[PDB]
Amino acid sequence: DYLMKILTERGYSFVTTAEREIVRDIKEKLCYVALDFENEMATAASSSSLEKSYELPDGQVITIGNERFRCPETLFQPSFIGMESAGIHETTYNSIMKCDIDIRKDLYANNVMSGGTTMYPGIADRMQKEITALAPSTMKIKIIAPPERKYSVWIGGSILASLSTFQQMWITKQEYDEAGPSIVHR
Amino acid sequence: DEDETTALVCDNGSGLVKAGFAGDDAPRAVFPSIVGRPRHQGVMVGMGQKDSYVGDEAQSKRGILTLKYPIEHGIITNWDDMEKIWHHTFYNELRVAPEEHPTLLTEAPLNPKANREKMTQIMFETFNVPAMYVAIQAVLSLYASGRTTGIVLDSGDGVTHNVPIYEGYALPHAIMRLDLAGRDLTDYLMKILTERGYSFVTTAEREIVRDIKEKLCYVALDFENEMATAASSSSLEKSYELPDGQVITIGNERFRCPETLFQPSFIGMESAGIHETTYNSIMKCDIDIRKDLYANNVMSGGTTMYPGIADRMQKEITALAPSTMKIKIIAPPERKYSVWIGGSILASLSTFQQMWITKQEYDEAGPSIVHR
Amino acid sequence: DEDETTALVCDNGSGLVKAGFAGDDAPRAVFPSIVGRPRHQGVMVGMGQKDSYVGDEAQSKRGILTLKYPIEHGIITNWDDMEKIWHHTFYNELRVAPEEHPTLLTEAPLNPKANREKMTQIMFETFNVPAMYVAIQAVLSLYASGRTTGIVLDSGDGVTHNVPIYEGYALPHAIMRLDLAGRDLTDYLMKILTERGYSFVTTAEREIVRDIKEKLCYVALDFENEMATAASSSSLEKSYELPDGQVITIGNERFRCPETLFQPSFIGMESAGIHETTYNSIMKCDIDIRKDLYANNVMSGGTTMYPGIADRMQKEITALAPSTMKIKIIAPPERKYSVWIGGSILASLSTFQQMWITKQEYDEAGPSIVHR
Amino acid sequence: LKDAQEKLELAEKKATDAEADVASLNRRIQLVEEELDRAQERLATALQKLEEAEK
Amino acid sequence: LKDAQEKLELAEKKATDAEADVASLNRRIQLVEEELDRAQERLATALQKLEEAEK
């Protein structure tokens, strides 16, 4: 919805519902998370061959040069959208300085990313450098972002549930009819 | 060989166990004297439910267990948890079966008669060792430095002691115990280092203050004009790099921590300090033996390893002792294992065989037999 | 009168400043300990450009400023921003000129020597007060309850402390600090109340969770069979009406919030809790003074105001203390200002005049003079 | 004698401070040399993975 | 005296052998630490070049 506005704001109109829906397909296909989002706006201005035109349901070739990355810069700067909360990288970090001390080297070398919105290319490099520069230099940072990440959650379940050792954690109707919903609740 | 190879030496401490085979030069096994009990039900991946944890697995997993120390101030306080540390020592650490190995154990200076009988009851009746023997710790330290008369200042993790020994017999009425040791000392550094403007916040910050104490701490001689030196600010300072980059600097406090051993007043202790106590032990002994004790102050224990401890003690007791006297502070390099090494020597010795308490002695005389 | 009227008492906290004239019964000025710095350039209608905001104007305008807290856990962490809060206190809140008023200030329990010297440097050298004095907070709380020996459990917005005091001298080595207080407590209620199925979404929802905590929260004795009671669902429930109609109900969580002070485990804290800590302070003190401390547990601080705090503490330490002992938990009604009132009394006192540090003492002895 | 013995606690003090710093610096060199075969080894692999992906 | 002075030429001898070995090992650690920022730096660049080419 933020891309929507920076794209109407680029001088456009997503007027019919066939215009609305495809802004989301623009976000998925053409959006980027640039590292050094600073001198990427600066780059935008010199106007390189950074621009990118998408052809709509019909001919209406829409161009998106710059906004292309202004959309995922929202994940590091919530201020782009009137959010006062902290952003993704700071939050990774704050989670970490809320944990036990002895476990913080582990968490830092194992930042696993999952979810459809973490798929924006260069998300991992920006996060890599975002937390290196907040973490004590004695630390090893490591941002794992696998390719199938839009289904990590599911795949982890597929593995686990097809596993040889999981059989003994399944809550059966025997457990339930005998223990009430409490049984699976743990 | 039957038992030349076969004698075990287990030194039970307040912080660490030291263990291994009589014959070796140093302990085969060194590990914390803890027994962890899980606060919640659950498992590690691939393991079963564990009722208990001992040594380093208890330390490493401390966040989900309630940790307990079986030996308070050198004395065994919980016998259920001690039999657990012994079990771990034989079966996992040294991986031996105990029922075919003679076992030399150690006890503390004025260890209650009843305890020496109880660990004998547990050694012979629940571990079924062939034979065993309990040596007093200061006595093994002395002996490992070759001699038989001297006074040992022994200082580890929970206790400090002075045990005057004459031709092998530790002198009961002259022994002094000071309950301030390396454990107390790590916690005081902790505060003078947070007080230097720092934070040992996570458990990976806590643990390493102890590794700062061991690596960088000093016992300065003329601790007076060492503070004075600190102020002119020489290249006396010392920065340590933490688990990460966070380079912490310790200049001065570096020696303010072992000055606690001479001044217990640094920590709200009203007791006298190490050097005075060495001395008081000595003016509590027979008169004719006091020149001997003075020329044979043997030091042992992890907390007596702070460099320049010996020079400070040297000058501390010269200046309290009558000038007609010869002072001599022996501090060997292996001193964090003196006790153990003295046991290794003694138990591998050719003449010790006839002092081993055998199951024959026990099944026939009751725990009284080894108690002496 | 010269200074009978004229002595100021400023108690600097982690959340609130309490200020006023020695002589008064309660603080003339109470306000947040913040300093706001505008995130953007612009003005309010009729005012000029303001570089900074302090107290309530910083809270009210928080959406356009970056708020900062000068006192972290009772210790002054930013001296540029603290001199700003003092300036505001004298000139705007109390509207006095400081250069003709003696100023009694307070510091925290183990406040670094260097800080007590720095706020003296700023009091005398940038505010030019005639004379000043720094009292320790627990010590003023005790004294305001008449006595001179007791142990204060002091708990405000960022820190909790236990300060055992004997004939006026706070006992350094027995003091305990627990970094969980009313601030931590409002944020935990927040979650158990959103977790009750709610949303404190706008900033007018956030702020009032704190007013729920103050008005409706309880410390139940037998917190065990109070949860059990919750379930049978008695008329224990309590609905509060929000800025608008939106009547929110809080039955149970009402006491789950102060049970955090006895169980830090409710919030992922591994530290011990208030009552155990009262006790541990006490078994760290001299033996002969422990009956005194036990019959004089004085409570002070905003977070010790939760009703039934005293009864729970009463029974919490009776059942840890040797039965030969008399337990006595004093919790006065004005306790959210004990500290301040103790300062008002002391500084208006007839005998205190001879302890004021004057510019004569300072210009002649350096900051060292007041440091003691 | 006071002079030979005093010259001494100072030469033995210096000997032990220098043995302590050499032990520390040798431990640090072994750790940075071991961080190495590791940095350089995953390197031969990362650069090989690049030439294959570029192809 | 003969014993304090003899203990001496030996403690001073040991002090100088240890100061010589620490100087050598510290020179070796600085060279292997400097081969490093270099191995690891071209690494951050080779791995970045991979993530961009793979993208």
From Swiss-Prot, chains B, C:
Residue(s) carrying ADP-ribosylarginine: R177
UniProt cross-references to SUPFAM superfamilies, sorted A to Z: Actin-like ATPase domain (SSF53067)
Catalytic activity: ATP + H2O = ADP + phosphate + H(+)
Pfam families: Actin (PF00022)
GO cellular component terms given for this protein: actin filament; actin filament bundle; cell body; cytoplasm; filamentous actin; filopodium; lamellipodium; skeletal muscle myofibril
Classification via CDD domains: ASKHA_NBD_actin (cd10224)
Gene coding for it: ACTA1
UniProt keyword annotation of Nucleotide-binding present: yes
Residues recorded with modification N6-malonyllysine: K61
The UniProt record lists the keyword Nucleotide-binding: yes
E.C. no: 3.6.4.-
Role description: Actins are highly conserved proteins that are involved in various types of cell motility and are ubiquitously expressed in all eukaryotic cells.
PANTHER family, A to Z: ACTIN (PTHR11937)
Modified residues (N-acetylaspartate): D1
Assembly and interaction partners: Polymerization of globular actin (G-actin) leads to a structural filament (F-actin) in the form of a two-stranded helix. Each actin can bind to 4 others. Interacts with alpha-actinin. Identified in a complex composed of ACTA1, COBL, GSN and TMSB4X. Interacts with TTID. Interacts (via its C-terminus) with USP25.
Localization terms from the record: Cytoplasm, Cytoskeleton
Name the UniProt record assigns to this protein: Actin, alpha skeletal muscle
Key words of the record: Acetylation, ADP-ribosylation, ATP-binding, Cytoplasm, Cytoskeleton, Hydrolase, Methylation, Muscle protein, Nucleotide-binding, Oxidation
Swiss-Prot record, chains D, E:
Signal peptide stretch: none
Localization per Swiss-Prot or TrEMBL: Cytoplasm, Cytoskeleton
Stretches that traverse the bilayer: none
Domain of life of the source: Eukaryota
Function: Binds to actin filaments in muscle and non-muscle cells. Plays a central role, in association with the troponin complex, in the calcium dependent regulation of vertebrate striated muscle contraction. Smooth muscle contraction is regulated by interaction with caldesmon. In non-muscle cells is implicated in stabilizing cytoskeleton actin filaments.
Family recorded in the similarity comment: Belongs to the tropomyosin family.
Domain statement: The molecule is in a coiled coil structure that is formed by 2 polypeptide chains. The sequence exhibits a prominent seven-residues periodicity.
Quaternary structure, from the entry: Homodimer. Heterodimer of an alpha (TPM1, TPM3 or TPM4) and a beta (TPM2) chain. Interacts with HRG (via the HRR domain); the interaction contributes to the antiangiogenic properties of the histidine/proline-rich region (HRR) of HRG. Interacts (via N-terminus) with LMOD2 (via N-terminus) and TMOD1 (via N-terminus).
Name under which the protein is recorded: Tropomyosin alpha-1 chain
First and last residues shown, out of full length: 64 to 118 of 284
